[PDB]
C-alpha cells in the first residue's frame, strides 16, 4: 500500500484532501522478537487512540467529518483560499499547533456530548 | 463464543448471511510468551485491517453494507438465485477471487471518496 | 596560515553515519483540523 504515500505532502490542503485513504492505509501494519513486537503494539495503540478521538467527536468511520463547532478567528484568520489553495497541511499544522488541544476539547467537551444528549431527547418524543 | 462458528459454511450464501455475527465474534481474541503474543498481535492487526477497509468504504459498524458501485457482469454473470440460493460463500469466493482487488478499489477509489466530498458540499448549503 | 589534518579512528558511529546521513525518521500525524464551510446537520 506504499503507493502515493505522502505524495500530496507538498500539495495544497485542498489537493491533499483527496488522498486521505493513501496515508490512512499506511498507518496500520529473543530481544529482536520483543522490540519489534512492541513497535507493532505501539502502532496499533496509536491508531486506536486516533480512532477513539474521531469516535468521541461524531466522526467515527469518516475521513472527512463536519461538526457544529464554529471556527474562532483567534485560532487562525486566514481566508479559505489562503488555507485550501495556497497552503499545505504541514504549514497549517505548524500554524495551528498551539490550538489543537482547545479545538479537540470543543469537539469532545462541548459538541457531540450535547448532540448525543439531544438525540437521546429527540428519540423519546 | 465458539457456538455455530462456520456452521453455515456449507449453507447457501443467503442462509449463511444470517450468521455473520457468529463468525465475527470468533475473529477477535520466554520464547513461548513471545510467539503466542505475536499471534495475538497479528490477530488484532488483521481485525483492524478489515475494519479499516470497511470504514474506507462507508460500511463502518456494519456487517451488511450497500454501496453505489454497480456490479459488472465481467466479474460474474450468475443470477441472484444462482448466488444466494444455490451457491455457498466458499464457491463464490473462489469464483470472484480474481476481482476482489478491483471491486475494493471501486469501493475505496471511486465511491465513498466521492460520497464524502458530496456530503461535504451538501452540508455547506 | 596552515592547517594539519590527521586520520582519526573516531567511533563506529561514523562509518554508518556516512550512509545514514541522508535518512530521517518521522512519525505520521494523520489527524488534522481546518476551517471549512461544512456544518453538521
Amino acid at each position, epitope marked *: 500500500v506504499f503507493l502515493g504515500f505522502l505524495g500530496a505532502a507538498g500539495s495544497t*490542503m485542498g489537493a491533499a484532501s483527496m488522498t486521505l485513504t493513501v496515508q490512512a492505509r499506511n498507518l496500520l501494519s529473543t530481544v529482536w522478537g520483543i522490540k519489534q513486537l512492541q513497535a507493532r503494539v505501539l502502532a496499533v495503540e496509536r491508531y486506536l487512540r486516533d480512532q477513539q478521538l474521531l469516535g468521541i467527536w461524531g466522526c467515527s468511520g469518516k475521513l472527512i467529518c463536519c461538526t457544529n463547532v464554529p471556527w474562532n478567528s483567534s485560532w487562525s484568520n486566514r*481566508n*479559505l483560499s489562503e488555507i*485550501w489553495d495556497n497552503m499545505t497541511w504541514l504549514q497549517w499544522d505548524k500554524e495551528i499547533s498551539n490550538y489543537t488541544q482547545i479545538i479537540y476539547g470543543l469537539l469532545e467537551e462541548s459538541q457531540n456530548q450535547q448532540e448525543k444528549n439531544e438525540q437521546d431527547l429527540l428519540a423519546l418524543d | 463464543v465458539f457456538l455455530g462458528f462456520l456452521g453455515a459454511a456449507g449453507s447457501t450464501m443467503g442462509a449463511a448471511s444470517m450468521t455473520l455475527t457468529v463468525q465475527a465474534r470468533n475473529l477477535l481474541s520466554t520464547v513461548w510468551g513471545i510467539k503466542q503474543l505475536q499471534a495475538r498481535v497479528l490477530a488484532v492487526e488483521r481485525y483492524l485491517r478489515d475494519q479499516q477497509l470497511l470504514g474506507i468504504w462507508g460500511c463502518s459498524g456494519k456487517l451488511i453494507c450497500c454501496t453505489n458501485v454497480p456490479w459488472n457482469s465481467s466479474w460474474s454473470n450468475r443470477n441472484l438465485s444462482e448466488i444466494w440460493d444455490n451457491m455457498t460463500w466458499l464457491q463464490w469466493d473462489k469464483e470472484i477471487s480474481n476481482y476482489t482487488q478491483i471491486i475494493y478499489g471501486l469501493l475505496e477509489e471511486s465511491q465513498n471518496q466521492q460520497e464524502k466530498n458530496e456530503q461535504d*458540499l451538501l452540508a455547506l448549503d | 596560515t596552515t592547517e594539519t589534518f590527521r586520520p582519526s579512528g573516531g567511533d563506529m558511529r561514523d562509518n554508518w553515519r556516512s550512509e545514514l546521513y541522508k535518512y530521517k525518521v518521522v512519525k505520521i500525524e494523520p489527524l488534522g483540523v481546518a476551517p471549512t*464551510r461544512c456544518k453538521r446537520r
Partner: antibody, heavy 124, light 108 residues
Framework: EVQLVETGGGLVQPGGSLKLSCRASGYTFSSFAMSWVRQAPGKGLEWVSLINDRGGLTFYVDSVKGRFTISRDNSKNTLSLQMHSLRDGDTAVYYC??????????????????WGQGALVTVS | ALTQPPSVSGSPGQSVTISCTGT?????????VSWYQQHPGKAPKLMIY???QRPSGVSDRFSGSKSGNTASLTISGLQADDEADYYCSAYAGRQTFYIFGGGTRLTV
C-alpha cells in the same frame, strides 16, 4: 476574458426533447459551479438548474425536476442540459452561467458570476 | 418570486432606489441577495452579490443594502448608459435555490 457560448437551441414540438450545450473559456471550468437560468420572452429571469464544480450534485426547480438533466464534462469544458418532455411553458432564452454554489473549501458563491448570451428554445 | 416594482425612473445625475421585497425564508434569512443589470437584447450582467459587494469592473455608483426582508439597489449619478432592466435574486435554501423578482425597467 471569460466567455460562455450556448448552442443547441431551436424549435421543438410539444412533448419533444432538446439538448443545449454551453462551451466556456477564460477560467478553470472545473473550479466553478454552473447554472442554467431561463427568461421567457415576456418575463424576468428564472433559475432552472444548478450543478456543482465536480458534476456530481444536481439541483432543479420543481417545474423541471423530473424532466431536465444537467451535466458537465470538465475535460471538454462543456456544460449541457438535456430537456425532455418539453412544455409550452418552457419557451425561453436559456442562459448558462458560472456560479451559484461552491465547494466547502471555497468562499461562498451564491450568485451568478458570469453569463453567456443565451440559446433560444421555442416549444410549438 | 420576489416583489419588485416596475417602471422605476430617475433623472441624470440624481439618485434612484430599486427596492426588492421578499419574505422571511429568503431575503430575511440569508445575506445572499444579488442584483443584475440586463440591457434589452443582451444577457444580464452581475452588479451586486452577497448584500453590499460589487464584482471587479463594476462602478461604485451601484450600492446595495438590506433591511428586514427588503433589499435595495441605489444608483447614484445616473448615466444615459444605465437604462436597463434590473433584477434581484436571493438564495432561499436547499429545497429551492434562487428566487428572482420581476424586472424593473430603469430609464434616465
Amino acid at each position: 476574458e471569460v466567455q460562455l457560448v450556448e448552442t443547441g437551441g431551436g424549435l421543438v414540438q410539444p412533448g419533444g426533447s432538446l439538448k443545449l450545450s454551453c462551451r466556456a473559456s477564460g477560467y478553470t471550468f472545473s473550479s466553478f459551479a454552473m447554472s442554467w437560468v431561463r427568461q421567457a420572452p415576456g418575463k424576468g429571469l428564472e433559475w432552472v438548474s444548478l450543478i456543482n464544480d465536480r458534476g456530481g450534485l444536481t439541483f432543479y426547480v420543481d417545474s423541471v425536476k423530473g424532466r431536465f438533466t444537467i451535466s458537465r464534462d470538465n475535460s471538454k469544458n462543456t456544460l449541457s442540459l438535456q430537456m425532455h418532455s418539453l412544455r409550452d411553458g418552457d419557451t425561453a432564452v436559456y442562459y448558462c452561467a458560472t456560479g451559484g454554489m461552491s465547494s466547502a473549501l471555497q468562499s461562498s458563491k451564491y450568485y451568478f458570476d458570469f453569463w453567456g448570451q443565451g440559446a433560444l428554445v421555442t416549444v410549438s | 418570486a420576489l416583489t419588485q416594482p416596475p417602471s422605476v425612473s430617475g433623472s441624470p445625475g440624481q439618485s434612484v432606489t430599486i427596492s426588492c421585497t421578499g419574505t422571511s425564508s429568503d431575503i430575511g434569512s440569508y445575506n445572499y441577495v444579488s442584483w443584475y443589470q440586463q440591457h434589452p437584447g443582451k444577457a444580464p450582467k452581475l452588479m451586486i452579490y452577497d448584500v453590499t459587494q460589487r464584482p471587479s469592473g463594476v462602478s461604485d455608483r451601484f450600492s446595495g443594502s438590506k433591511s428586514g426582508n427588503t433589499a435595495s439597489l441605489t444608483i447614484s449619478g445616473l448615466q444615459a448608459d444605465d437604462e436597463a432592466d434590473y433584477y434581484c435574486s436571493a438564495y432561499a435554501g436547499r429545497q429551492t435555490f434562487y428566487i428572482f423578482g420581476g424586472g424593473t425597467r430603469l430609464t434616465v
